[PDB]
């Protein structure tokens, strides 16, 4: 309780960084699912739709070529296999580390 109180822009709160393997899953999802950010938010329960849109906005700055290359390398779609691939690869990443 004091009149010195600071006010500044807190809307940039600390969000969880993105993993390289998580990025690899993101690309195989563009290969596998498409650009339906709501659907991708469902395949990644740890990421919400706005996180997917921000991820796309960051990727498009340099990696448009990889976006297209993944999008043309199409794969049949299965949510269940997708979830298993995620947690297995994450567990493998932790075990390697």
């Amino acid at each position: 309780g004091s009149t010195t109180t600071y006010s500044s822009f807190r809307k940039n709160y600390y969000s969880k960084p993105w993993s390289n393997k998580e990025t690899d899953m993101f690309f195989l999802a563009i290969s596998m699912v498409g650009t339906d950010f709501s659907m991708i938010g469902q395949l990644f329960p740890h990421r919400a739709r706005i996180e997917i849109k921000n991820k796309f906005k960051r990727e498009e700055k340099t990696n448009g070529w990889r976006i297209d290359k993944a999008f043309q390398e199409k794969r049949p779609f299965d949510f269940d296999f997708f979830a298993h691939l995620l947690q297995k690869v994450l567990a493998e990443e932790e075990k390697r580390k």
Binding site: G34, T35, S38
Partner: peptide
Amino acid sequence: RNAEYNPKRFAAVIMRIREPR
């Protein structure tokens, strides 16, 4: 393949193309 939509909150579908981006 290049669309996103949520019927339960919004009344329009979002789509993108890579060229022109």
